[PDB]
Design a protein around this ligand. Structure first.
Ligand SMILES: CCCCCCCCCCCCCCCCCC(=O)OC[C@H](COP(=O)([O-])OCC(O)COP(=O)([O-])OC[C@@H](COC(=O)CCCCCCCCCCCCCCCCC)OC(=O)CCCCCCCCCCCCCCCCC)OC(=O)CCCCCCCCCCCCCCCCC
Lengths: 110, 52, 31, 90
């Protein structure tokens, strides 16, 4: 893993509306195949940088588990930021519709 | 709307996609056997199926 | 002559393709 | 040997044909060997430019020529290993 700060900055630029107009202008004379190939090439460049530079270079976060810990941290951040938020919303929804635990209730007895 | 309430259908939402990076691996992995091979020894299968 | 063009690094260093894995058999999956 | 022929462009192999000779070190003892640049250039007639590997600095030869070269090498090596080898290549 690497360039997390650059990724945050990319997300910021993406949400900035002015960049929406800039991208609208850049998309003049452009194809979906070209856009897809460019994105795929960017991702491949990132992963190739990793594969090459891990052989001789060590980041500030280097540890006896290597990039496994950084990847687990990315996963855990994604989890706590998105999935647990969705769980909170679903919990409030279920509590308003059926009551807390309503989705695990037993079938009506016959 | 008595017999029309079980007709309001909504589709599932599962996506069956997972990147398969094999360049990361260099060893084989174990695999399950799901069914007995009936293409060989077909005539004796009921007679040797209970053994091991 | 002198050099004035701003030379990108992609014209020099080409990255390997690692996103999609290699096919050493050179045959498609259905085959 | 591999089928990786360096591009003779100066951006890759600086000073390829500036002189009429090439030099190489051979073996663990690193014996010197000089080779005529024309004998070398004979390879770039079979070189195929569609194929480029190792940061696009090495082309590949045609399999026919590459295997002829490998066969000559293998013949020399097995003759060296054998004792009944001919005292001349005539
Ligand atoms: C709160 C933590 C808990 C989070 C939620 C729980 C989640 C649990 C799951 C954890 C999963 C972790 C994710 C792992 C994936 C990899 C991430 C990674 O390695 O890169 C991260 C990334 C590093 O990017 P990079 O690609 O490695 O490039 C480095 C640069 O070149 C720069 O090069 P450099 O050499 O100059 O420095 C390298 C590196 C150096 O990083 C270090 O080595 C750490 C330095 C101090 C050592 C001790 C660390 C722990 C105690 C002090 C820090 C407390 C904050 C906790 C930081 C946890 C990460 C170590 O820089 C940093 O990462 C700075 C991080 C510290 C920012 C402090 C901001 C303070 C605001 C919060 C108030 C104070 C804390 C409140 C109490 C929180 C208690 C939990 O760090 C950033 O966050 C970038 C910030 C960009 C500016 C954003 C604007 C400022 C906002 C500040 C907050 C930024 C977000 C951090 C949130 C935490 C603070 C609230």
């Amino acid at each position: 893993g690497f360039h997390f700060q650059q990724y945050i900055a990319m997300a910021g630029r993406a949400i900035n509306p002015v960049q929406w107009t800039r991208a609208w202008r850049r998309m003049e004379g452009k194809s979906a195949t070209e856009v897809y190939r460019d994105a795929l090439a960017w991702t491949n460049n990132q992963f190739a940088q990793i594969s090459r530079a891990s052989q001789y270079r060590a980041w500030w976060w280097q540890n006896p588990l290597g990039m496994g810990l950084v990847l687990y941290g990315t996963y855990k951040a994604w989890h706590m930021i998105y999935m647990v938020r969705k769980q909170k919303k679903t919990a409030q929804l279920v509590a308003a519709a059926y009551g807390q635990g309503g989705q695990w209730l037993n079938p009506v007895p016959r | 709307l008595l017999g029309h309430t079980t007709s309001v259908t909504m589709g599932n939402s599962d996506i069956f996609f997972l990147p398969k990076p094999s360049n990361l691996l260099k060893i084989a992995l174990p695999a399950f056997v799901f069914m007995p091979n009936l293409t060989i020894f077909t005539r004796a299968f009921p007679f040797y199926a209970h053994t091991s | 002559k002198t050099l004035e063009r701003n030379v990108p690094m992609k014209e020099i260093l080409q990255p390997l393709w690692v996103v999609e894995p290699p096919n050493f058999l050179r045959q498609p999956v259905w085959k | 040997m591999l089928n990786f022929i360096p591009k003779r462009c100066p951006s890759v192999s600086l000073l390829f044909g500036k002189r009429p000779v090439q030099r190489i070190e051979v073996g663990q003892a690193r014996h010197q060997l000089e080779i005529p640049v024309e004998t070398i250039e004979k390879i770039y007639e079979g070189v195929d430019s569609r194929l480029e590997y190792h940061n696009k600095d090495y082309n590949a030869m045609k399999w026919k020529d590459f295997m002829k070269l490998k066969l000559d090498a293998y013949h020399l090596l097995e003759a060296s290993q054998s004792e009944t080898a001919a005292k001349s290549a005539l």
